[PDB]
A paper describes a structure:
A single copy of SARS-CoV-2 main protease (MPro, nsp5) is encoded within large polyproteins (pp1a and pp1ab), which encompass all nonstructural proteins (nsps) 1–10 and 1–16, respectively. MPro mediates its own release, termed autoprocessing, through stepwise cleavages at its termini, accompanied by stable dimer formation and appearance of mature-like catalytic activity. Processing of the polyproteins to mature nsps is critical for virus assembly and production of viable progeny virions. The chymotrypsin-like fold of the MPro catalytic region (residues 10–185) is connected to a helical region (domain III, residues 201–306) through a long loop (residues 186–200).
Room-temperature X-ray structure of MProD48Y/ΔP168 was obtained in the inhibitor-free form at 1.85 Å resolution. MProD48Y/ΔP168 crystals are monoclinic in space group I2 and the unit cell dimensions that are different from those of MProWT, accommodating one enzyme protomer in the asymmetric unit, with the native homodimer generated through the crystallographic two-fold axis. Residue D48 is part of a short 310-helix spanning residues 46–50 (termed S2 helix henceforth) that creates a side wall for the hydrophobic substrate binding subsite S2, which D48 itself is not part of. P168 is located at the tip of a β-hairpin loop consisting of residues 167–170, that acts as a lid of subsite S4, binding hydrophobic P4 groups of substrates and inhibitors. In MProD48Y/ΔP168, the catalytic C145 and H41 and other active site residues including the deletion site ΔP168 are well ordered as indicated by the strong electron density maps. In contrast, the electron density is weak for the S2 helix where mutation D48Y is present, with high atomic displacement parameters (B-factors) for these residues. The active site in MProD48Y/ΔP168 is more open than in MProWT caused by the movements of residues belonging to subsites S2–S5. Specifically, the helix, spanning residues 46–50, shifts by as much as 3 Å from its position in MProWT away from the catalytic site, resulting in the adjacent α-helix, which is not part of the active site, containing residues 54–60 to move in unison by about 1 Å. P168 deletion in MProD48Y/ΔP168 results in the β-hairpin loop shortening and a loss of hydrophobic interactions made by P168 with A191.
Author numbering:
A (entry chain A), B (entry chain A): 1 to 167, 169 to 306
Amino acid sequence: SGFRKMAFPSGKVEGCMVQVTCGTTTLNGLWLDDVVYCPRHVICTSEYMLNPNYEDLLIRKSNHNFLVQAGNVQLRVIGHSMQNCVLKLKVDTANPKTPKYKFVRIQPGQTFSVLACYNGSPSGVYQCAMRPNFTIKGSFLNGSCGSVGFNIDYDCVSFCYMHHMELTGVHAGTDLEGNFYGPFVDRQTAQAAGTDTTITVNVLAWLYAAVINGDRWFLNRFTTTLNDFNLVAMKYNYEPLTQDHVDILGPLSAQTGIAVLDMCASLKELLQNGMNGRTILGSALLEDEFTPFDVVRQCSGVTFQ
Amino acid sequence: SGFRKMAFPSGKVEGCMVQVTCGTTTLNGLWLDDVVYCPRHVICTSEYMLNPNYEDLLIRKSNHNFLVQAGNVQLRVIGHSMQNCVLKLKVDTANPKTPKYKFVRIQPGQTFSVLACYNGSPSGVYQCAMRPNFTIKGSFLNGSCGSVGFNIDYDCVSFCYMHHMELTGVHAGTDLEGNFYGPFVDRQTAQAAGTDTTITVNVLAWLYAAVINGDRWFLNRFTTTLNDFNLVAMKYNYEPLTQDHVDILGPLSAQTGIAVLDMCASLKELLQNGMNGRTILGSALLEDEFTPFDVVRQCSGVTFQ
């Protein structure tokens, strides 16, 4: 019993973090086999943080301009190239701690773990969601660039995020092929995050977790239709609900015996009348950063190795 | 910028988790050098979950009654003994992944990371606090017994908690010398958790984190004394505040320029008037599971290796 914001165990990723220095800039890189991946803006200098030409900046570098260190060992850079917004540094030694991995691009509403790092050294792990506006509400200080986000699926690490920049309180980055999430660029412009919305299917999954854990006070006997619900949801800046979402919630409906559309009726009331000073799973707000799979994993107990 | 419930990287601990089976009972153990530590109730059977005599149960066992597996490798048990509520299983192979470690007993209000495990396999990591009533509000399903709680101090893992039982929604366990936190026993009796209170010094540390991150709406120009504050705090089930707590908050007072007693005045108002539908660091409740050190670590950026 109980319900926590739970991150994936980070051991497999900790062994891939290295420090990358170019000039006076130091940040983090990801070392898989004989390639180190890091944000390309490690080659930028003040004058260039405004309007950089990365192809120009890269052609003026050579392999020995890149100091890469895995702890105390130094890695020899034997080749470099750029793929979109990441730099791929070829090194002379393959990481012997390379896990089984793949590179995946996630969708808004999906969650992952972030291993926050400074100077190549792991500092903390936490769980977050990709927001509908393609930012994450992370926790990052200067020097955290190159920290990665990941999920663990069986024995396999799915890398889905590399941190690049902070934009007025929230955080933006790329997948591991170097393509940004959202309409952001790795330079100084007037870019801001767009309007965020609440991830409705995640709120419903969390209300199911609450029932599983004994919080039942918000239930009622009413029911509703997808279209009546989506009418009220749009008013409160909630993502609309599809039939696909209903099916995804199937397992949780089965385990609690409460139909999805029954639960939607409870959500509709919570949105119109409020919490009334009561809490749900220790929160006074409706929580939207747990997916249906997160709830199943924590309320049924899947492991990895 | 940003503020998250951040756990320690778990890699160093993942390499010490093993599976321990005795009879039909399987749970988790901690393998450091050539000793496996696990809850002693792994030797109990139904008839004994009520009123067990553990010395009797242990004398009727031999080394080959204990199946210990580190992944796929099996470990040979060459000796066993009991220290308070833990079992120490001597095995024929020293764990080569044994980190630098020590065994510490924590105080209520202190936080640590939990590596939740099933069948010896790590499943998730999360941060929690030891409550003033000596329970933790964890997330554990059947089979999680033997999962450990820890902090990382420099290069050194401080083990502080081993999970033993669930008591009506909350969780109870021992230090690694086998002594329970709180007045609990590892048998079936009528034991319940006592009344919990809110950890005041932690709430103040969190309000400082909020200011550091730009949430200032709750501040005011008033001030107060320790005794006036503690008078109102007792009314709301808050732990009283000592001069020691004030000193601990020193660094955060220095960084924000807001005196502790100034901040206490803001807390006093929040307790008497409420949140008024506004949030602090994304919460509509006063959060008490971040220590002053947690805030410094996240808002200044200490790493480990």
